[PDB]
Write an enzyme that holds these catalytic residues in place. Sequence first.
Site, PDB file in Angstrom:
ATOM      1  N   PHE A  35      16.555  17.091   8.787  1.00  0.00           N
ATOM      2  CA  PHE A  35      15.371  16.939   7.942  1.00  0.00           C
ATOM      3  C   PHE A  35      14.584  15.695   8.121  1.00  0.00           C
ATOM      4  O   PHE A  35      13.407  15.664   7.742  1.00  0.00           O
ATOM      5  CB  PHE A  35      15.730  17.014   6.429  1.00  0.00           C
ATOM      6  CG  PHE A  35      16.611  15.887   5.954  1.00  0.00           C
ATOM      7  CD1 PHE A  35      16.087  14.662   5.644  1.00  0.00           C
ATOM      8  CD2 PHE A  35      17.988  16.064   5.858  1.00  0.00           C
ATOM      9  CE1 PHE A  35      16.916  13.625   5.224  1.00  0.00           C
ATOM     10  CE2 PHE A  35      18.824  15.018   5.437  1.00  0.00           C
ATOM     11  CZ  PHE A  35      18.283  13.798   5.153  1.00  0.00           C
ATOM     12  N   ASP A 189      24.645  24.606  -0.292  1.00  0.00           N
ATOM     13  CA  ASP A 189      24.932  23.690   0.849  1.00  0.00           C
ATOM     14  C   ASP A 189      25.669  22.449   0.384  1.00  0.00           C
ATOM     15  O   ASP A 189      25.325  21.318   0.742  1.00  0.00           O
ATOM     16  CB  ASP A 189      23.652  23.324   1.625  1.00  0.00           C
ATOM     17  CG  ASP A 189      23.954  22.777   3.029  1.00  0.00           C
ATOM     18  OD1 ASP A 189      25.056  23.030   3.494  1.00  0.00           O
ATOM     19  OD2 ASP A 189      23.089  22.105   3.608  1.00  0.00           O
ATOM     20  N   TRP A 192      30.429  17.858   1.767  1.00  0.00           N
ATOM     21  CA  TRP A 192      30.854  16.578   1.160  1.00  0.00           C
ATOM     22  C   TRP A 192      29.918  15.409   1.442  1.00  0.00           C
ATOM     23  O   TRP A 192      30.104  14.353   0.891  1.00  0.00           O
ATOM     24  CB  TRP A 192      32.293  16.245   1.528  1.00  0.00           C
ATOM     25  CG  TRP A 192      32.662  16.044   2.964  1.00  0.00           C
ATOM     26  CD1 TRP A 192      31.968  16.413   4.096  1.00  0.00           C
ATOM     27  CD2 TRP A 192      33.898  15.488   3.420  1.00  0.00           C
ATOM     28  NE1 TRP A 192      32.688  16.080   5.211  1.00  0.00           N
ATOM     29  CE2 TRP A 192      33.881  15.522   4.823  1.00  0.00           C
ATOM     30  CE3 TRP A 192      34.988  14.921   2.777  1.00  0.00           C
ATOM     31  CZ2 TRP A 192      34.933  15.024   5.581  1.00  0.00           C
ATOM     32  CZ3 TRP A 192      36.037  14.449   3.532  1.00  0.00           C
ATOM     33  CH2 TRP A 192      35.993  14.489   4.904  1.00  0.00           C
ATOM     34  N   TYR A 228      18.744  19.829  -2.009  1.00  0.00           N
ATOM     35  CA  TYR A 228      18.502  21.203  -2.451  1.00  0.00           C
ATOM     36  C   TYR A 228      17.749  22.029  -1.423  1.00  0.00           C
ATOM     37  O   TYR A 228      17.117  23.015  -1.762  1.00  0.00           O
ATOM     38  CB  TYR A 228      17.836  21.208  -3.823  1.00  0.00           C
ATOM     39  CG  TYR A 228      18.477  20.216  -4.757  1.00  0.00           C
ATOM     40  CD1 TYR A 228      19.843  20.252  -5.030  1.00  0.00           C
ATOM     41  CD2 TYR A 228      17.757  19.168  -5.313  1.00  0.00           C
ATOM     42  CE1 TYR A 228      20.431  19.268  -5.823  1.00  0.00           C
ATOM     43  CE2 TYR A 228      18.333  18.202  -6.113  1.00  0.00           C
ATOM     44  CZ  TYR A 228      19.681  18.266  -6.405  1.00  0.00           C
ATOM     45  OH  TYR A 228      20.239  17.324  -7.223  1.00  0.00           O
TER      46      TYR A 228
HETATM   47  N1  LIG Z   1      19.930   9.668  -3.887  1.00  0.00           N
HETATM   48  C1  LIG Z   1      20.740   9.210  -2.923  1.00  0.00           C
HETATM   49  N2  LIG Z   1      21.527   8.142  -3.187  1.00  0.00           N
HETATM   50  C2  LIG Z   1      22.366   7.725  -2.235  1.00  0.00           C
HETATM   51  N3  LIG Z   1      22.550   8.229  -1.010  1.00  0.00           N
HETATM   52  C3  LIG Z   1      21.757   9.271  -0.744  1.00  0.00           C
HETATM   53  C4  LIG Z   1      20.826   9.821  -1.650  1.00  0.00           C
HETATM   54  C5  LIG Z   1      20.234  10.898  -0.945  1.00  0.00           C
HETATM   55 CL1  LIG Z   1      18.984  11.930  -1.561  1.00  0.00          CL
HETATM   56  C6  LIG Z   1      20.781  10.993   0.283  1.00  0.00           C
HETATM   57  N4  LIG Z   1      21.714   9.988   0.425  1.00  0.00           N
HETATM   58  C7  LIG Z   1      22.527   9.709   1.604  1.00  0.00           C
HETATM   59  O1  LIG Z   1      21.887  10.267   2.731  1.00  0.00           O
HETATM   60  C8  LIG Z   1      22.715  11.282   3.328  1.00  0.00           C
HETATM   61  C9  LIG Z   1      21.857  12.392   3.857  1.00  0.00           C
HETATM   62  O2  LIG Z   1      21.162  13.105   2.834  1.00  0.00           O
HETATM   63  C10 LIG Z   1      23.687  11.663   2.224  1.00  0.00           C
HETATM   64  O3  LIG Z   1      24.869  12.242   2.786  1.00  0.00           O
HETATM   65  C11 LIG Z   1      23.920  10.329   1.540  1.00  0.00           C
HETATM   66  O4  LIG Z   1      24.797   9.453   2.253  1.00  0.00           O
END
Ligand SMILES: Nc1ncnc2c1c(Cl)cn2[C@@H]1O[C@H](CO)[C@@H](O)[C@H]1O
Length: 338
Positions: A35, A189, A192, A228
């Site tokens: 993404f 989805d 972990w 999401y």
């Molecule tokens: N709100 C958050 N607060 C902390 N970490 C976050 C997020 C988000 Cl959204 C993504 N990630 C990190 O980015 C990766 C890819 O989406 C995830 O696996 C998290 O490590």
Amino acid sequence: FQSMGECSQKGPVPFSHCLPTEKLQRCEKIGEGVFGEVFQTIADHTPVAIKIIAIEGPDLVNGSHQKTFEEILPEIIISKELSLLSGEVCNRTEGFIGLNSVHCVQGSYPPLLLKAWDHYNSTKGSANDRPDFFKDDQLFIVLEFEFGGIDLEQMRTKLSSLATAKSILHQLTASLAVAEASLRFEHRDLHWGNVLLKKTSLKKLHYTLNGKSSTIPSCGLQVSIIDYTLSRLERDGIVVFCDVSMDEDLFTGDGDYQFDIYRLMKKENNNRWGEYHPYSNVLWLHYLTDKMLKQMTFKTKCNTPAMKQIKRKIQEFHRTMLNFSSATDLLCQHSLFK
Ligand SMILES: Nc1ncnc2c1c(Cl)cn2[C@@H]1O[C@H](CO)[C@@H](O)[C@H]1O
Ligand SMILES: [Co+2]
Ligand code: NA
């Protein structure tokens, strides 16, 4: 209007609208996927996470085509609906991540974000393209979220004990149940990487399911569910979802139970993704329980019979939970949560 009508700017904004100088300067890259990119920064003394997704252009990005505005709208809508559950009454949970704002931005990628991207590549290594090839007409969606902590995958070796794993599973099951009840939600989805953990001083966390409030012992952590992109929900009978019926690649992964869950969802729903099949939430919770038992390693093992019993009850959850129809069924009926 920007941010779903909660920002007074109309039409696209520059990156500097979302990332004024000091906020931009404090950006550090914390995650990625096909993404796009996720940065952490700080404003008003409070960390936030910024998810940046290129849209509407013809270039491949990280090997895939960019979503159109129509294609990215469901994630935007669902992020907002799930955030709003923290302020609801009958069905209330803080177990999804807060959404501060969402903007459509136009411009080339900020050099300061490229600097942060480079530092992450140099230290952790990236699977993405360096996002330095965008032109000044490029559009992006910038989602600013509450900072949710560290993902469960990165916490593989960092949790105290399986008692903590129990709390985490209870928090996840409760959040999903509340979203089922409010929104006929399926995450779809919940690998972990999408379970975040942050320290809390609260001893108990509160939720309300169909008007009945309860609490969950925190073990010092608050769980937040994110991402999401594949999710589904409905309001007043109108459904928002990602139609993956014609996707090849989603169903042909191997080497992790994660990839089986995609296939198992498709079996459950007969490849009809608009329908409501809350069993998908049970399948993801099974995959997460399976991670807790097989891949997580805890600082303190289950050394006493009381800790061995928690371990046995989580093993029992693992072997029985597939016989429940939804997260709501699990929360309300499973002995683990009594
Ligand atoms: N709100 C958050 N607060 C902390 N970490 C976050 C997020 C988000 Cl959204 C993504 N990630 C990190 O980015 C990766 C890819 O989406 C995830 O696996 C998290 O490590
Ligand atoms: Co704004
Ligand atoms: Na949360």
